[PDB]
Amino acid sequence: ETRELQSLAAAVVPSAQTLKITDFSFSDFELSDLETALCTIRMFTDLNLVQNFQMKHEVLCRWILSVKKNYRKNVAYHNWRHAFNTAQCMFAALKAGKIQNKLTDLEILALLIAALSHDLDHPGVSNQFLINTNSELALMYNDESVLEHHHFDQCLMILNSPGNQILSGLSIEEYKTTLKIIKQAILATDLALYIKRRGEFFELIRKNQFNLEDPHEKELFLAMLMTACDLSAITKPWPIQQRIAELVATEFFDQGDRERKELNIEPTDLMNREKKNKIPSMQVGFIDAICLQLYEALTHVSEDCFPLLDGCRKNRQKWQALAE
Ligand SMILES: CCCOCCn1c(=O)nc(NCCOC(C)C)c2cnc(-c3ccc(OC)nc3)cc21
Numbered sequence: 320e321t322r323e324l325q326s327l328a329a330a331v332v333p334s335a336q337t338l339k340i341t342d343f344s345f346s347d348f349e350l351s352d353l354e355t356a357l358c359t360i361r362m363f364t365d366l367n368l369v370q371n372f373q374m375k376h377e378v379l380c381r382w383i384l385s386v387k388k389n390y391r392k393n394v395a396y397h398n399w400r401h402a403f404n405t406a407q408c409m410f411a412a413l414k415a416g417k418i419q420n421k422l423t424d425l426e427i428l429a430l431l432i433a434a435l436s437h438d439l440d441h442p443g444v445s446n447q448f449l450i451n452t453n454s455e456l457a458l459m460y461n462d463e464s465v466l467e468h469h470h471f472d473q474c475l476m477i478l479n480s481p482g483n484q485i486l487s488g489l490s491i492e493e494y495k496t497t498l499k500i501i502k503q504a505i506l507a508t509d510l511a512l513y514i515k516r517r518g519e520f521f522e523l524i525r526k527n528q529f530n531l532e533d534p535h536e537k538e539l540f541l542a543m544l545m546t547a548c549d550l551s552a553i554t555k556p557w558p559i560q561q562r563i564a565e566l567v568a569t570e571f572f573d574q575g576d577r578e579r580k581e582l583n584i585e586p587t588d589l590m591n592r593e594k595k596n597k598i599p600s601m602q603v604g605f606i607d608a609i610c611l612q613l614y615e616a617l618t619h620v621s622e623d624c625f626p627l628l629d630g631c632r633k634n635r636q637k638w639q640a641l642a643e
């Protein structure tokens with residue numbers, strides 16, 4: 320929409336301080352859609368991406384609105400607000416968490432784009448569901464990280480669309496490198512790839528062998544940072560985290576309803592509204608098994624990332640009081 324582009328491109332962009340986007344405790348709940356788009360421009364601006372990459376304001380504005388438009392409004396959790404919150408957590412980890420200091424402008428550019436694009440056109444159903452219902456997407460990508468390959472395909476489509484080419488000014492070598500980093504960062508959002516690769520990351524930290532100058536270690540770190548940002552709603556102050564967990568559960572139960580109606584199966588506990596009683600004990604298990612070690616490792620990388628670990632520990636204690 321041309322009208323929405325004009326509304327955004329002609330608007331004054333408030334400061335990062337005013338928008339509170341540097342805060343790990345940030346909440347999008349009170350913001351209007353236009354305000355989330357203004358926050359997004361501010362993220363690109365303050366990470367020196369607009370200046371460094373000579374980005375055309377109108378093009379960046381069109382791209383943000385195209386990304387926002389390509390998230391489904393009938394998806395409870397994996398929608399524009401979650402992608403926006405993931406990017407905000409990336410901005411906070413880069414600024415407040417001091418991750419910016421450890422990466423190049425090209426990596427930062429790729430991470431912010433990947434954070435905003437990582438769930439593009441998420442259908443609100445898991446990879447397993449798409450393989451189960453024999454969906455065309457599952458066939459296109461050989462049942463491996465189906466959604467994640469699709470999110471990158473949607474990301475590229477937007478980047479290649481007329482008037483949305485925010486990378487048009489990059490040199491050919493920079494452009495190819497950025498797309499490769501974006502692709503790897505989006506694929507990293509598949510929790511199966513996080514579990515597969517995390518052991519190597521935790522071992523590198525434990526042995527003090529963690530070296531960001533090594534290209535293989537750099538890619539591994541960017542993958543871990545993507546997961547940390549993706550799951551970051553689990554680290555928010557209790558009331559904010561509780562409201563998002565309700566959306567997470569709503570999406571899982573919506574898939575379960577689809578499985579009951581289309582496949583005639585009793586869904587897995589995670590996807591079964593009738594087994595909503597398992598939520599608190601399952602949240603404790605998931606935080607302990609998946610979340611804590613990741614936030615611990617990121618804090619070892621940069622001490623300033625501690626609020627993510629602190630919030631995760633506080634939420635674990637709260638969910639446990641509900642489950643016990
Ligand atoms: C609330 C719904 C019930 O959650 C139960 C716990 N739980 C789970 O058991 N399994 C998940 N994924 C599939 C299995 O994965 C294995 C373990 C690798 C799973 C995925 N995401 C969340 C989540 C994320 C952010 C978030 O932010 C607030 N709140 C909850 C929780 C999750």
Ligand SMILES: [Mg+2]
Pocket residue numbers: 437438466508509
């Ligand atoms: Mg995803």
Ligand SMILES: [Zn+2]
Pocket residue numbers: 397401402405437438508549
């Ligand atoms: Zn996500």
